């Protein structure tokens, strides 16, 4: 009978394909690298993770998005997000099912999770610096679908954050450099040690090249995306 439109989510696959292509072009091995030619400021992301707390020993991973909304991915594989109005909540279970509630009007079974989210929110506000504070996100964030944290992991050197909109963010611990990868735009935003930022179209990095600093981080990114797909 009728089919409808089953979700065949290709975003991670597309990201791998894009990274494989850019890396195979050996972008830092050029007679003259012309990195600026690959800039595309219009591809600036709408959302990224601005703060995070790994309390997975007890509760889960709490995070803030750049629009000031907060979320928690709990240890039971459920998600709770509080919008930037500070009142409205979205609850996402293990199967991806979404429901809506508020801090004052909610199912009793979610009381603990709401209390914990508030603890995460307050902790991040009191203690943590907002990443990309100098970045104005792409216009229309209120009109876009607010993403949640699908997957995350930490390596020795980085945290890898996979958002439901297909974006993958990699924050490097030692030097505070960060990558925001979007497979829809086929773009990467690089935040350097000085907090200066640039957005590049990956296909243009293939054509024009880039510095060793970015090229090496894109090789690492490919490895991380492979891990997400594994």
């Amino acid at each position: 009978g009728p089919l409808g439109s089953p979700e065949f989510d290709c975003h991670l696959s597309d990201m791998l394909q894009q990274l494989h292509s850019v890396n195979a072009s050996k972008p830092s091995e050029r007679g003259l690298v012309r990195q600026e030619e690959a800039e595309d400021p219009a591809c600036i992301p709408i959302f990224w993770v601005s703060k995070w707390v790994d309390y997975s020993d007890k509760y889960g991973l709490g995070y803030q998005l750049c629009d000031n909304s907060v979320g928690v991915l709990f240890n039971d594989s459920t998600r709770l997000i509080l919008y930037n109005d500070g009142d409205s909540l979205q609850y996402i279970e293990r199967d991806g099912t979404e429901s809506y509630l508020t801090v004052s009007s909610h199912p009793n079974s979610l009381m603990k999770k709401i209390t914990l989210l508030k603890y995460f929110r307050n902790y991040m506000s009191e203690h943590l610096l907002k990443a990309g504070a100098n970045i104005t996100p792409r216009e229309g964030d209120e009109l876009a679908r607010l993403p949640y944290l699908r997957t995350w992991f930490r390596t020795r050197s980085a945290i890898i954050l996979h958002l439901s909109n297909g974006s993958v963010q990699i924050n490097f611990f030692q030097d505070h450099t960060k990558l925001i990868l979007c497979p829809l735009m086929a773009a990467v935003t690089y935040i350097d040690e000085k907090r200066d930022f640039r957005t590049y179209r990956l296909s243009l990095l293939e054509e024009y090249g880039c510095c060793k600093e970015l090229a090496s981080r894109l090789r690492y990114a490919r490895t991380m995306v492979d891990k997400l797909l594994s």
Binding site: W52, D54, H127, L128, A131, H176
Partner: peptide, 6 residues
């Protein structure tokens, strides 16, 4: 672990 502090 946590992100960068103030």
């Amino acid at each position: 672990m946590q992100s960068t502090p103030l």
